[PDB]
């Protein structure tokens, strides 16, 4: 069960190694827009938080 959008949930991800291909290349998503980041190069990038 998800949050109501007026009470939208937030979670912090940190101190970990990602693989955004597991997300982006999955078939289930009907929308995966990215702003100021490419969905592909996202998997080569790294972030503070």
């Amino acid at each position: 069960r998800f949050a109501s959008v007026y009470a939208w949930n937030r979670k912090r991800i940190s101190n970990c190694v990602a693989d955004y291909s597991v997300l982006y290349n999955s078939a289930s998503f009907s929308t995966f827009k990215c702003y100021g980041v490419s969905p592909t190069k996202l998997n080569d990038l790294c972030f503070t938080n």
């Binding site: 100021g36 980041v37 490419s38 592909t40 190069k41 080569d44 990038l45």
Partner: protein, 49 residues
């Protein structure tokens, strides 16, 4: 170039190209004016010599 792929990066890079290139034209233009004024002091010192 690490964060956007080509088709999107082109939009951002061209803003840096034009901003830098206009900033380098301004330098060269003002050096041409300075050089033409030192040249006038060279042509003066050449005749004081």
């Amino acid at each position: 170039l690490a964060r956007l792929d080509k088709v999107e990066a082109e939009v951002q890079i061209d803003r840096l190209i034009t901003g830098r290139l206009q900033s380098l034209q301004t330098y060269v233009t003002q050096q041409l004016i300075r050089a033409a004024e030192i040249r006038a002091s060279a042509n003066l010192a050449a005749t004081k010599m």
